[PDB]
């Protein structure tokens, strides 16, 4: 009937994810996703490099207290002399407007209202 | 032909397991464990409580370079005032006797021979 703001999405992890070995295969860590909210919102990801990391869905548009899986590979490597403290992934999202059309668009986040932002810190274990 | 020590049996983790969130659920942990040995060995899982955590299979006989899965479920819980330092896990093994029986026994600890063991650190990630 009135206003409502994006809805805070649960995340789990919320903020802290370390990437248990082995480093030996790609290794794609499940994430859970809720919508808090009353509306559907348009949410994506980005990370510090999108070669190494790859998340999927990177983009789309979850619905009224709707669960979504995700998935985080990370193409194997040696962690034996590379430092592990600079990567980080990006959750936004911003509540839809009345009736958006089937599919992510950019002006969500140029319009009305606010978008919200959130870096979960990526982490590795041996 | 000759004699033969119980081959390391690789562990993935091999000494850090960081139980991602969330723990509002039952979470089994999957981990990957090889026999790195010529032949079968005996193997066993201790924790320090075997009520909240629940290893399986707890102990089995591991062939020649064969791959074995585990589970480690960790029942729900309030990690917001609970101290979580002091959780840890332990796998032994031993090379069974020529020719050993189709169930693991106990005299392969007690017999000739030396047998492995090393501790898991637990961790809680939110």
């Known amino acids: 009937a009135q206003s409502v703001p994006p809805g805070d999405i649960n995340t789990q992890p919320s903020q802290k994810i370390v ?55 990370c193409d194997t490597f040696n962690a034996a002399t590379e430092d592990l403290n600079n990567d980080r992934i990006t959750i936004e999202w911003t509540n839809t407007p009345d009736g958006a059309a089937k599919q992510f668009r950019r002006e969500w986040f140029q319009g009305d209202g606010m978008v919200r932002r959130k870096n979960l810190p990526i982490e590795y274990n041996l």
């Not at 909210?37 to 990391?53: D, E, F, S, V």
């Open 19 to 73: 990437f248990n070995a082995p480093y030996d295969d790609k290794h794609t860590y499940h994430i859970k996703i809720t919508n808090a909210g009353g509306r559907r919102i348009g949410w994506a990801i980005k990370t510090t490099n999108m070669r190494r990391l790859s998340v999927d869905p990177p983009c789309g548009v979850l619905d009224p207290k709707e669960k979504v899986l995700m998935a985080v590979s």
